[PDB]
């Protein structure tokens, strides 16, 4: 039946494609042409519609496609843009859950993680070959992403930017397949140049390529490598930035058989190079990750936990920590008698001194071509290859020697966190988009106003991973409706993992050990 595609597709063309993939193709072709007209985009490539009608996927997508022949092989790099359609329902999957002696099945919709199967990709490749004529071409996966059903398609600015970013990545991957030279400390280490860095206690969120908010408590900014006394580059003005890492810190309530009860879980939510640089490679990513390490290694992250004193509406007010402590009460942090010293004491008794470094990993994110190696490095059939790629990336940064710090085959680079991440946003009182991750441990304690039993039910939902994830997802959504509100939109899900402490030691020390010295701007607190 599915093998009749061999007859169905032999000749001719048809009238088809869903309403969103149709509209999306039309706007993306318009944007391509305007970008060429303004000379922002080069006219060396093609945009294609992938149909659920003409070919074998549940979800249609547009394909950002670039090509070159590399050493005789035709190579195509594709960055799919999934187009979910609110009016189209793909048949659901049966989730059978063996609840001890009780067996029950939950049916559920396929998300981009379930949709982007290995065959989904292979079908994308085949269609491109039909559309490009390159039937013997190899196709590079730049990472599928999704442009969600919900918003109006008239945002030409964002859509233009999506094409720009997607072609950037396509050029990188053709280049890196072509053998292009890597990013390294040697390029930064001018004989007359040094690095410096600071922690930004932002007070604001940051936004992905489609404009959705990303939680961050601290933005780590690594300054441009340079030195006073160097030749000024004519009449210029520039931001002195090299890269940045977005992160936040939760306070996880963790077991112990003497440590205090909460863990300073430092979570990377995003990794970006400064906007003036176009390329996106593993070496650039890996180098930037050292920015999160310094958050607790040299500086002190705990300043981010200070309550917004004077602000009534602080949903994550530290005062909530008193509900997990022996007080079983909110600390009065509204008062003129609440001091910096009292804050430090709450933490002395409640929060552990040893930082833990972890990060999100998203196969469908803005950095998916790279996120995918870090995800496969967690485990599975190609873990060894993904790990080899990552250690090679750091060695490219330092000129070898990562191996002088530890054995990557005894110490895999990233461990699973188990509980995965539901992403989404909610609207605040003025209708702005805010990250749903705000109901973190302090957030949830204030949301239940001290009802510890309600908190613990939620907390167990977010921690006990012997419970099938569908059951956990349903309870997590039930809790958002009661505590966050009904104005909640869900977005593409993501993985989380723990960076191996030895990977971290080797990355940070190896860079410092080759002389790429970085000064702290916050010289003392």
């Amino acid at each position: 039946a599915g093998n009749l595609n061999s007859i169905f597709q032999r000749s001719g063309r048809t009238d088809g494609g869903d309403a969103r993939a149709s509209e999306a193709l039309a706007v993306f072709n318009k944007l391509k042409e305007e970008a060429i007209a303004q000379q922002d985009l080069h006219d060396d490539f093609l945009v294609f519609r992938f149909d659920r009608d003409q070919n074998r996927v549940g979800y249609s997508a547009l394909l950002v496609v670039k090509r070159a022949a590399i050493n005789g092989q035709q190579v195509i790099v594709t960055r799919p843009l999934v187009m979910p359609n609110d009016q189209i329902t793909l048949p659901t999957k049966k989730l059978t859950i063996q609840n001890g002696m009780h067996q029950e099945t939950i049916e559920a919709e396929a998300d981009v993680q379930d949709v982007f199967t290995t065959q989904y990709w292979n079908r994308i490749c085949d269609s491109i070959r039909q559309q490009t004529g390159k039937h013997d071409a190899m196709v590079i996966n730049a990472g599928p992403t999704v442009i969600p059903a919900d918003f109006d398609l008239k945002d030409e600015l964002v859509l233009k930017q999506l094409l720009i970013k997607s072609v950037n990545l396509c050029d990188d991957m053709l280049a890196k397949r072509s053998g292009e030279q890597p990013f390294s400390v040697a390029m930064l280490k001018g004989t007359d140049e040094t690095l410096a860095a600071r922690l930004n206690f932002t007070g604001k969120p940051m936004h992905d390529s489609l404009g959705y908010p990303i939680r961050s408590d601290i933005l780590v900014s690594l300054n441009r490598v340079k030195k006073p006394g160097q030749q000024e580059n004519e009449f210029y003005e520039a931001e002195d930035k090299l890269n940045q890492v977005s992160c936040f810190v939760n306070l996880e309530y963790t077991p112990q058989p003497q440590l205090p009860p909460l863990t300073p879980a430092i979570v990377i939510t995003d990794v970006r190079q400064a906007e003036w640089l176009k390329a996106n490679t593993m070496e650039l990513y890996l180098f930037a990750l050292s920015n999160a390490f310094r958050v607790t290694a040299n500086q002190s992250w705990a300043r981010s936990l200070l309550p917004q004193l004077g602000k009534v509406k602080d949903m994550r007010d530290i005062g909530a920590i008193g509900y997990l402590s022996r007080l079983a009460a909110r600390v009065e942090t509204k008062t003129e008698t609440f001091t910096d010293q009292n804050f430090a004491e709450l933490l002395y008794n409640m929060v552990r001194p040893s930082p833990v470094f972890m990060s999100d990993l998203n196969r469908f994110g803005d950095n998916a071509a790279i996120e995918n190696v870090f995800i496969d490095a967690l485990g599975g059939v190609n873990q060894q290859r993904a790990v080899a790629a990552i250690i090679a990336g750091v060695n490219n940064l330092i000129g070898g020697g990562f191996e002088k710090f530890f054995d990557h085959n005894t110490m895999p680079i990233i461990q699973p966190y188990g509980t995965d991440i539901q992403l989404g946003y909610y609207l605040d009182g003025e209708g702005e988009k805010q990250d749903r991750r705000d109901l973190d441990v302090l957030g949830a304690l204030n949301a239940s106003d001290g009802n510890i039993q309600e908190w613990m039910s939620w907390y167990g939902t977010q921690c006990n991973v012997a419970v099938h994830p569908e059951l956990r997802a349903r309870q997590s959504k039930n809790f958002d409706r009661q505590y966050l509100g009904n104005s909640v939109t869900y977005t593409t899900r993501a993985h989380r993992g723990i960076w191996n402490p030895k990977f971290i030691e080797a990355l940070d020390k190896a860079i410092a050990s080759v002389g790429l010295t970085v000064a702290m701007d916050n010289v003392a607190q």
């Binding site: 982007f116 290995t118 590079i140 996966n141 967690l378 599975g380 873990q383």
Partner: peptide
């Protein structure tokens, strides 16, 4: 508990 792998490329 298990890790699925999609069709990644370039690095392998």
């Amino acid at each position: 508990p298990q890790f699925g792998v999609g069709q990644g490329s370039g690095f392998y």
